[PDB]
Structure formats: structure tokens, C-alpha cells
Design a protein around this ligand. Structure first.
Ligand SMILES: O=C(O)/C=C/C(=O)NNC(=O)c1cccnc1
Ligand code: NI
Ligand code: NI
Length: 436
């Protein structure tokens, strides 16, 4: 039978060193009573203002409400994808930053100060680890945290908790996982805020650790008290799995990460829209969208971007409507991207019109199809999906506030849209032409 180790065990110190050295822990002592205070009320103020939400994720081909309440503070315009769910940052004061709520923006700025501290301490440790022992900028980058994700769980009004399967560690707030979508070998710093035998103490919160693939090696259970911080360094998050073992009391955690956001920033997706729209004759913003090229490469590029802004951004955003609760930082940008998206509906319709046009040689028409077909296919599947997901039984479980908006959405009676929401008629017709 699988077993686990805690500080009570003799072998614990030895196991931590030879099979888990890139895991670091810094107890509350290592953090000022000054910093402890504001962070926990930055925590609390954020909480009774109702900023944290359970997410309606997807894992193992099934829609699931997350027991843990989440919110993503971080750089302006940054996103972080979490189980096919793009979380958008509630923004933190950054140099040359602007503006939303007074009480709430206070907390944000805090978790930033928090972020700064953790950053320093991660560099020390990554220095010490390299000095433990034989570039200096790879270290600085792997600690360059751009977001934190906040987590809450009251175990006592959410008393529906799984048993840990491999080492009898007890109840799990969060089952064994690798944190996704981070920069390679980049660190993770967690601040743990708990409010107030034969193995691990069940009333006290623990982070657990196992080696991937490996339920034979005794796992590690790390007791976290009020204000304890741990640190996953370098390749730890890749080689090891971790889980959260629930206590009895509530608990918060600020988990600072370096998200790979090379395609997950506002500037990134805006620039993408601009590249799509280079193929548009852009004298005037009207409904007579006309294109500069019909070269196959340019057309697929446009329609792939069409898809990117629609499903990675718009549908992801409005699935989780009801952000405007924390800060209206994304309100304008989402409007801007909806407009950009709409214009590309025009582009699509424009291309469709062109494919049916009289004086066009089939070989040039057959070439155009093959360029846009998969992208229009892929648009059909994910449209069906996005709002299957957006009206399922556990989507109608609604508090009035929390409804999963399916946006954008329109139907036939809508002559403000150049195209139908369902493209099966079109994708059919286009495919029959290609097998003629
Ligand atoms: O609260 C803590 O100490 C750590 C919680 C934790 O391990 N969070 N990580 C994730 O929720 C997660 C899951 C799947 C992908 N990326 C991140
Ligand atoms: Ni987390
Ligand atoms: Ni994690």
C-alpha cells in the first residue's frame, strides 16, 4: 500500500532532499508582520466584495463547476489559460499604468507588492540552487511573475471533497496536477493563508507532492500554516505532480506564475486582428467589405484569425460574464475585439461571394476552398460546442449574476449580420464543390 511522509516522520527530511530538492518552503517568519497584515485584508476585502468565482471548466470531456473560487490579478492585458478557460487579469498597478474600484484596486496593488517580494526570494533560491552547487538572466526571467491566481475554499459549506487515491493523504481541495501554460522551467510561488496521529493532520492544510508516473515512492505532505509560502523551482512542476489537501477551516492562496502569454495578451490578439484586416480595403467602416487579395495563404490566415479572436477571446470572455464586478478594464477591449470580429464576418461573407462569382476559373475557386475549408469546419465544431457548453444543465444552475452569456449570438431574423450563426449549409455546399 502507498504511504506518505510529513514532518512527523524521521525519513521526511531525507526524502525531501533526495527526491524533492527543488521544492522550497518559507514559513510565516520569513515575511514581515506588516506584509502579512495587508495581504490578508487585501485577501478579505476582495472576498466580501465577491470577486472570486467558481469556474465552469472542462476536464475529461465533461462540464464541471470548480469547488475552488478563483480570480486572476496581474499585468494589464494578460491572460492565463486554465483547463480550457481563459482567465483575464484584474489589473495591478504597473509602471505607466492607468486607473477600478478604490477598495478593490488597493488589494490589487497589494498582491503586486506581494508579487515583488516573492520575486526576489525566488531569485535567491534559484541562485542558491545553482550555487548548490557548481545565465543570470534566465534566472531573473523564470522569476518574472506576470500574474497571480487567487484561490478560496471553505471546506465546511462546500463539504464535497474527494479522497486522495495513492498515499492515503486525506481529503483534496485540488487533485494531483501539473500547473499548465507556464514558461518552461519557470518558478511558482504560493502564499498560503489558512484561517486559524497516523499520518497527516486532517484539520490542517497541506500541499502534497508526488513524482509523476510514480505512486510507489512515498509522497510528501507539507503542512501550511497561516502565512507559509512554498516555491516550485525550475523543472519541479514538470517532474512532480502536486495536490492540495484540505483542512477544516477556510483558506486562501495567492499562486504567482509566469504564464506563457505569447498569444495571450491584448496587444497580441489586437495585432493579430490588424494583420487580418490588412486584406481589407479600409477607406470607410461600412458593410461593403471588399478584399485586396484572394491568394490562398492570405485568406486562410484571415479566417484562422477570425477563429482565434472569436473562440479564444470573445466566447472565452462572455462565458464568464458578470469581471465588470471587479474592474471594467476589459469592457472596452472586448467591445473593440467584437467590432474587429464583426468586420471579419464581412470578410468571410466577402470571400464566399467571391467563390460563387461568375468569371472565375474553377482551379482558382477550388484552390480558395482548400484554403478556407478546415477553418470554416473548425468554426462549426467550436460554435456548436461553445454553446452546448453554455446552456447545459449545470449552466442553468444560475445565480442571476453568474449566467454564461453566449456571445456573440444572433439568428436568421437578424439582417445586421451578413452571415448565419450556423454554417452547416455553407460548409456542406463548399465541400460538395470540392469533390465535383
Ligand atoms: O493553493 C495552493 O497552494 C496551490 C493550488 C494549485 O496547485 N493550483 N494549480 C491549479 O489549480 C492548476 C490546475 C491545472 C492547470 N494549471 C493550474
Ligand atoms: Ni491555483
Ligand atoms: Ni497547481
Amino acid at each position: 500500500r502507498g504511504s506518505h511522509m510529513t514532518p512527523k516522520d524521521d525519513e521526511f527530511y531525507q526524502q525531501w532532499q533526495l527526491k524533492y530538492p527543488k521544492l522550497i518552503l518559507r514559513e510565516a517568519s520569513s515575511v514581515s508582520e506588516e506584509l502579512h497584515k495587508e495581504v490578508q485584508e487585501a485577501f478579505l476585502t476582495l472576498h466580501k466584495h465577491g470577486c472570486l468565482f467558481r469556474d465552469l471548466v472542462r476536464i475529461q470531456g465533461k462540464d464541471l463547476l470548480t469547488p475552488v473560487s478563483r480570480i486572476l490579478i496581474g499585468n494589464p492585458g494578460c491572460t492565463y489559460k486554465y483547463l480550457n478557460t481563459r482567465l483575464f487579469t484584474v489589473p495591478w498597478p504597473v509602471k505607466g499604468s492607468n486607473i477600478t474600484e478604490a477598495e478593490i484596486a488597493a488589494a490589487c496593488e497589494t498582491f503586486l507588492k506581494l508579487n515583488d517580494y516573492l520575486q526576489i526570494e525566488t531569485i535567491q533560491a534559484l541562485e542558491e540552487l545553482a550555487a548548490k552547487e557548481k545565465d543570470e538572466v534566465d534566472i531573473k526571467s523564470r522569476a518574472a511573475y506576470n500574474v497571480t491566481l487567487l484561490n478560496f475554499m471553505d471546506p465546511q459549506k462546500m463539504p464535497y471533497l474527494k479522497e486522495e487515491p495513492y498515499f492515503g493523504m486525506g481529503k483534496m481541495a485540488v487533485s494531483w496536477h501539473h500547473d499548465e501554460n507556464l514558461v518552461d522551467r519557470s518558478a511558482v510561488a504560493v502564499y498560503s493563508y489558512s484561517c486559524e496521529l497516523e499520518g497527516r493532520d486532517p484539520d490542517i492544510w497541506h500541499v502534497g507532492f508526488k513524482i509523476s508516473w510514480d505512486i510507489e515512492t512515498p509522497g510528501l505532505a507539507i503542512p501550511l500554516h497561516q502565512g507559509d509560502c512554498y516555491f516550485m523551482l525550475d523543472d519541479l512542476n514538470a517532474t512532480h505532480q502536486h495536490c492540495v489537501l484540505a483542512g477544516s477551516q477556510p483558506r486562501f492562496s495567492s499562486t504567482h506564475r509566469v504564464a506563457e502569454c505569447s498569444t495571450g495578451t491584448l496587444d497580441y490578439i489586437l495585432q493579430r486582428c490588424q494583420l487580418a484586416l490588412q486584406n481589407v480595403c479600409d477607406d470607410v467602416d461600412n458593410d461593403d467589405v471588399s478584399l485586396k487579395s484572394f491568394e490562398p495563404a492570405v485568406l486562410k490566415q484571415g479566417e484562422e484569425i477570425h477563429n482565434e479572436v472569436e473562440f479564444e477571446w470573445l466566447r472565452q470572455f462572455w462565458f464568464q460574464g458578470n469581471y465588470r464586478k471587479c474592474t471594467d478594464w476589459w469592457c472596452q477591449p472586448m467591445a473593440q475585439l467584437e467590432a474587429l470580429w464583426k468586420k471579419m464576418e464581412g470578410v468571410t461573407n466577402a470571400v464566399l461571394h467571391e467563390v460563387k462569382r461568375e468569371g472565375l476559373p474553377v482551379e482558382q475557386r477550388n484552390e480558395i476552398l482548400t484554403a478556407i475549408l478546415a477553418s470554416l469546419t473548425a468554426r462549426q465544431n467550436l460554435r456548436r460546442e461553445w454553446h452546448a457548453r453554455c446552456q447545459s444543465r449545470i449552466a442553468r444552475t444560475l445565480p442571476a449574476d453568474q449566467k454564461p452569456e453566449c456571445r456573440p449570438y444572433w439568428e436568421k431574423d437578424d439582417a445586421s449580420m451578413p452571415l448565419p450563426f450556423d454554417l452547416t449549409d455553407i460548409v456542406s455546399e463548399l465541400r460538395g464543390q470540392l469533390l465535383e
